[PDB]
């Protein structure tokens, strides 16, 4: 595994910079799109609206992320009810067969760009009920998953770390910069 740089070696490395695309763009047009691409990502990154799914006993720890101790809202994360206004879905709990068509539909109704987070073992791979006769073995069978948060339930910080991974994943989208090459 790639280990972190030592202090002395890191003592020379240049400051990272904010944009993951750097300021090394050859042309003006490319550079403007790169900077303009950051503006989109800065927007979507800032305000990520979950859907308030809350299926099973991960759902309780999905409340304590909104509790004052950790305060999801500090990061611009605001819970919402309608899937139209919701941007992210946190599938937290055991997605049984009876639910499975309902999650698919609710996910479909969510407008793009939509990212899915899988909370806990139940939604990751079927978890403790993996072999049950009425459990979908992981929600990735039904909807694409963008971040997997392990745990049972994941700690509140663990989910917070998951959300920040989604911000970083959002931060590095190349929606515009890849249109130029296309």
């Amino acid at each position: 595994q790639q280990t972190l740089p030592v202090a002395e070696v890191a003592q020379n490395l240049p400051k990272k910079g904010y944009s993951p695309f750097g300021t090394k763009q050859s042309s003006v047009a490319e550079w403007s799109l790169a900077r303009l691409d950051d503006l989109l990502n800065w927007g979507r990154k800032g305000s990520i609206w979950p859907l308030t799914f809350g299926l099973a006993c991960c759902a309780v720890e999905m409340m304590h992320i909104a509790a004052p101790r950790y305060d999801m809202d500090r990061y611009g994360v605001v819970f919402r009810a309608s899937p139209r206004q919701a941007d992210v879905i946190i599938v937290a709990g055991t997605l049984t067969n009876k639910m499975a068509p309902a999650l698919r539909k609710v996910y479909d109704q969510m407008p793009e760009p939509r990212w899915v987070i899988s909370m806990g073992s139940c939604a990751n791979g079927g978890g403790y009920y993996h072999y049950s006769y009425s459990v979908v073995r992981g929600c990735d069978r039904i909807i694409p998953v963008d971040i997997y948060v392990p745990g049972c339930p994941p700690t509140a910080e663990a989910l917070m770390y998951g959300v920040l991974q989604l911000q970083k994943k959002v931060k590095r989208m190349k929606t515009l910069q890849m249109w130029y090459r296309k």
């Binding site: 309608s82 899937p83 068509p101 309902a102 999650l103 539909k105 609710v106 479909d108 109704q109 793009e112």
Partner: protein, 117 residues
Amino acid sequence: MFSIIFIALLILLITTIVMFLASILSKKALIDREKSSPFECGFDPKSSSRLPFSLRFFLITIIFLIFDVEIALILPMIIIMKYSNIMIWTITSIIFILILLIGLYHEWNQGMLNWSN
């Protein structure tokens, strides 16, 4: 007026431009047969929204039409207090508000203000 109409149009144009920007600035993806389906908590809907929706405050609904048209007759009061005969203005105004209260309390006591049960 004519000033207000012009700004009324100018605002409407401006607000209209806002979505006309949103409609283009919006990310565009192929629409799915399920993406545009209605939202009813993730399960297909049994009943169209265009079925007859029963009503229970119908009686109040009609009383609302009335009570407004007496708001047309109280509003002019102030404007004509300096200019009117005080007895006629005083007497008539009171027997205007007593009539309203008596009407209200009469129905309240008869239980019409309560919803259909």
